Each structure stands twice: as structure tokens, then as C-alpha cells.
Design a binder for this molecule. Structure first.
Ligand SMILES: [K+]
Ligand SMILES: [Mg+2]
Ligand SMILES: [Mg+2]
Ligand SMILES: [Mg+2]
Ligand SMILES: [Mg+2]
Ligand SMILES: [Mg+2]
Ligand SMILES: [Mg+2]
Ligand SMILES: [Mg+2]
Ligand SMILES: [Mg+2]
Ligand SMILES: [Mg+2]
Ligand code: NA
Ligand code: NA
Length: 86
RNA sequence: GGGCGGCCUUCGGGCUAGACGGUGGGAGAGGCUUCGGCUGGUCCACCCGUGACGCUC
């Protein structure tokens, strides 16, 4: 579920400015937020499988944004890859 | 890794129409579950955010 007291919390942390809600960093961060939130899920339910489909999609997406931000803005890449760790 | 890709530009650099994110909706014979749930995807809107971040073996 996450909720604002989570999803907004991350954004307010990775935002590049007061109102940022879709800046690659934020996009990656909260992307890494539900990636875990679901990694944990799959454990309790090792028979789900179907949900793993998205675990993979989300993971790929997260790496594609990161590669994008690695070309256009190296500095910010190391920054972001921290506070989360790649 | 490969192949093919938006607009403008005096090529320095602009920009949003794509994609993604935020918000708010919608439908579903998704899946798993000790039945208390936990969760994947999918389609809409806006005229909010990033700014081609894409599509394809
Ligand atoms: K499915
Ligand atoms: Mg696809
Ligand atoms: Mg440019
Ligand atoms: Mg999506
Ligand atoms: Mg709803
Ligand atoms: Mg049900
Ligand atoms: Mg759901
Ligand atoms: Mg917009
Ligand atoms: Mg730029
Ligand atoms: Mg291009
Ligand atoms: Na094309
Ligand atoms: Na223009």
C-alpha cells in the first residue's frame, strides 16, 4: 500500500526542489521503494510467481532510468546510487 | 551489445506532443494466502513533475 506517509516521504526526500515529484531521482527512489516492498512480499508467498513478473519489470525500469541519468549527469548518478546503494 | 527513433537550433543549446513519474478515477473470472490479507498488471483524466529518459531482436 505504502500511502503518503511513505510515498510522499520519499519524494520530499529525493525531490530536487519543493514540488518535484517526477525527476528521475524521485522516480528511481520510490521505484526502489516498492521493489523492496514487494521483494519482501514474494518471500511470505513463494507460490505467487505472477507478481514476480513485475518485480522484473520494475527492476529493469529502475536500471534504465539509472543508465539514462548516468550519461546526462554523472555527478547526480553517484549521489542517487547512494542512500539506496546499487 | 545490436538495429531503428520526437520538435526547434546559428549546434552552443532550447522544448514538450512520446515515455515515465504525481494525483484522481475505472474494469477486471491476475496471482498467492492459515481467509485476517498481501500483492502484479491493465485502461482513463489532468492540462502537475522529469525532459526522448523510447520502440525492437
Ligand atoms: K498478468
Ligand atoms: Mg511491453
Ligand atoms: Mg540538450
Ligand atoms: Mg506503468
Ligand atoms: Mg481505484
Ligand atoms: Mg479477490
Ligand atoms: Mg491491487
Ligand atoms: Mg504534465
Ligand atoms: Mg537537459
Ligand atoms: Mg534521440
Ligand atoms: Na519507430
Ligand atoms: Na520549439
Amino acid at each position: 500500500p505504502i500511502t503518503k506517509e511513505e510515498k510522499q516521504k520519499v519524494m520530499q526526500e529525493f525531490a530536487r526542489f519543493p514540488g518535484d515529484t517526477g525527476s528521475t531521482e524521485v522516480q528511481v527512489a520510490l521505484l526502489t521503494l516498492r521493489i523492496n516492498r514487494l521483494s519482501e512480499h514474494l518471500k511470505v508467498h513463494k507460490k505467487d510467481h505472477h507478481s514476480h513478473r513485475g518485480l522484473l519489470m520494475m527492476v529493469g525500469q529502475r536500471r534504465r532510468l539509472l543508465r539514462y541519468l548516468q550519461r546526462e549527469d554523472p555527478e547526480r548518478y553517484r549521489m542517487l546510487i547512494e542512500k539506496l546503494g546499487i
